[model samples]
Every structure is written in structure tokens, then in C-alpha cells.
Target: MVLSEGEWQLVLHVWAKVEADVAGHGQDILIRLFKSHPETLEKFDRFKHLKTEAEMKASEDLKKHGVTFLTALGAILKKKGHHEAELKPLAQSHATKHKIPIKYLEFISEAIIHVLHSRHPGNFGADAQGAMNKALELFRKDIAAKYKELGYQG
Candidate 1:
């Protein structure tokens, strides 16, 4: 799932704007993930007590986690290719150290598209969305492959 030069440019162009609102976009992605994958919340002790949308939205820990996620994602997006090393830190730590299930990795791309649709609908049209999907899928594949190398049986 290699992105063409034009696709890269398109993604970067729109993503630059999206990046400016990383906190807000990140928050949206996290919220969407928790809602769609309730089991995900179990991994975050800081978030386990969030019972309502208001609590989720207002929680400082949630806000910090959101910012951290988007920051890392932005860095990954800036890199040219889906190199395993590019994702090693995040992928290894999450899967190997924390034992986050590989199944949860699937939530990331969906959450991204959800945020883009809600925040930058015009820019996140068919072409841009396809480009992002390919890029993220490639990222996920490489990360999972690396996790396998780390001796994860799951």
C-alpha cells in the first residue's frame, strides 16, 4: 500500500491543517475508538472511570493521551515510507510491553477517518481518504509484522 507522490502531497496538504487541531481531532478519535471498541478502555487505567461523554471529554488524562497519540501519528505520517523501524517504538511498546491485542490496532484507521470526516470533510474526499487508508494499512501491517518478530504469539 504505497502512496503515490501526488497522494502523499494531497495527504500532507490536508493533514497539515488537521494537525493544527491535533488535540481536538485526537480527542474525537479516542472517543470514537472507546465507543466502537469498549474493550479498549480496559487498557487505560486512567480512563476506566470515564462513565459519561462529559467525563470523557473533560478528563485531563484523556486530553493528554489524545495529544500524545496525534503527535506520534503526525510524526509517523511525516516519514516517507512504512519502515518497520519508523513504527518500532509505538508498535513494540504497545503490543509487546503492554500486551495490547493486535485486534485493537484495527481501531486506529477507523478513528482517523472518523476524525477527518468530522473535521475536514471537504479535504477528506475519496482520493485523500484512499491515500490515508493505504498508508495506515501499510503502517499497521508493518507494525504487526514487527510485533511478530518480537515473539508475540497473538
Candidate 2:
């Protein structure tokens, strides 16, 4: 029921991406995510606001490393359709490095939605919300199904 450490790192890496954008490290990443997945904006009204030059820089100041890490880990790991065998290394590594509970990763998924909601606003409308809900359900199944198959003793 918990993610391995490597999974946590993936979350951290993804959060780093958001942090970079929020911290003014760059804008293309956030732009790319919403532009590619426009529906995401409905949940995150402020996402578009980040498009501005001033916000691009000022937002960066709100990095919140911990929150970023949590949100990113969940976002990165939820892609069961993409990264199937990634959890093992993720779990191992995170356990070794940060000493944080991998179970906390579950909460990260909610954190991801929180971030998206804060940024996209109307972007996550009824349709998008429904789709996101489905995605999360599938994501949960993927993690559990994959974890069981991986034979993780933990």
C-alpha cells in the first residue's frame, strides 16, 4: 500500500519541475503541461496567471520544497500507463535518502490535485473533473496491481 523510495524521487523530480517554473527557473514546463493537457486548467485557475512575466518570477519565490516534492511524486508516479516498473527503485531510493514514509506518497496524489486546482481553476470543469476522477481511479488500480506483481516484500 506504500510507494517505494524511487517512486518518491520521481515525485521529487516532477516537483522540481514545477518548482523551477514557480520559482522562475523556467516557464516552458508548466506551459507545456497545461497546453498539452488544457483540461488541467479548470482545476487550477492560477495556472494561467503564472503565464505572466511578473508571476513567473514572483511565483518562483513560493517554491515550498516540501509541498512540491509531495505533489510531484504523486504526479510522476500516477502515470501507470507510462512508468510500469518504476516503483521498486523509487521506493528503495526514497527510503534510503529522505527517510520519509513512502505511504505518504498516497497523500501526494491529493496534493497534485490541490496544485492543479490552485493553478487551473475552471480548467478542471465537470468534464475534466470527471476525467480526472477516472484517471485517479485507474491510477490507484495501476499502483496496487503493479505493486502486487512486483513482489515487493515491504
Candidate 3:
């Protein structure tokens, strides 16, 4: 996917906002997301136990890794025709380890981007639309590959 410099700046800004295991950032973000999409609760019962800021903060390793990974991904989103197809391994890894369905990957990708854009509308511009769409396409395709990796090709 190709992205103009301005769009890349917005992507990077969003990635940088996701601090690793911050006191309440994870739960704060998750609560907002889940509230907006209640049906998401059906996919992961872990949400029940994750009721508090402390509980969410306990996921430090995961949060740290995710933040780091997303930061890197934003950098990659800038190049011309860059394959957004790399996210599949991410879906497979997370699904296999956490027992979540690969379908949830789409929601995760979309939700994060939405949250970023909504939080800082001024940072994003119309040019970001096409780049983001291509990015999501890469995310979905990578998620498909993840299903195959897990032998859940069905």
C-alpha cells in the first residue's frame, strides 16, 4: 500500500499513543471498544476477568509487544505498494495462543484504527483513506493465511 507522508505521520502518531502496559491505557481503550461493539463480548470471555485497570495492566508483556509491533507496522505502511499481507502471521499467532477466532482479527484491526482517527481527527486527512483501506486489506489477507497456518482452513 502506498501512503503520502502526511498519512504515515498519522499512522505513526496512533501507534505511539499505545503505551506498553500503561496503568490504564489497555483497559481504557478496550472498554471503549467493547462498549461500542457489545457483540465483541461473545468472542472472548477474558473480558469478564479484565474488569479492572490492574487486571489489564497485568498483561504487560503482551501489551508491550503489541505496541512495539504496531509501531513497526506503521513505519512499513509508508512505502509504495508495500505488501500489507504481513499481518496474517500475527492473527495466527494470537489466535493459536489465545484461543480466539481468526475473525476477531478484523475487528481488532478496524477498532484500533478507528480509535486513533476518532481521538485525533485533526491528524488524519482524506489521503489516509486509500492507504488505510489497503492496509486493512493486507490485514484481512494476513488473517486468512493465519487460518491456514493453524490448520483451520475451513
Q: Compare the candidates by lDDT and give the number of the best one.
A: 1
Tens digits of per-residue lDDT, candidate 1, 1-154, equal: 6778888887787789877888888788899999988888988887988988788999888988899988887888888575556587877788777787667877868888888977888888998888888888877777778778888834
Candidate 3 TM-score to native? 0.57
The stretch of ten residues in a row with the least summed lDDT in candidate 3 is 18-27
Listed per model in order, the count of residue pairs whose N, CA or C atoms clash below 3 Å is 0, 31, 2
The Cα RMSD of model 2 versus the native structure comes to 12.6
* TM-score, every prediction: 0.93, 0.40, 0.57
Which of the two, 1 or 2, has more TM-score?
1
| Candidate-wise lDDT, in order | 0.81, 0.46, 0.54
Model 2 poorest 10 in a row by lDDT = 23-32
Tell me how far the alpha carbon of residue 79 in candidate 2 is from the true structure, in angstroms, after superposition.
6.3
lDDT of 2 by residue, 1-154 (tens): 3444554444444444455455332233343334455454344444555554445345653345334543444554455346545545654444444333334434444554555556555554454444544455555555555544545422
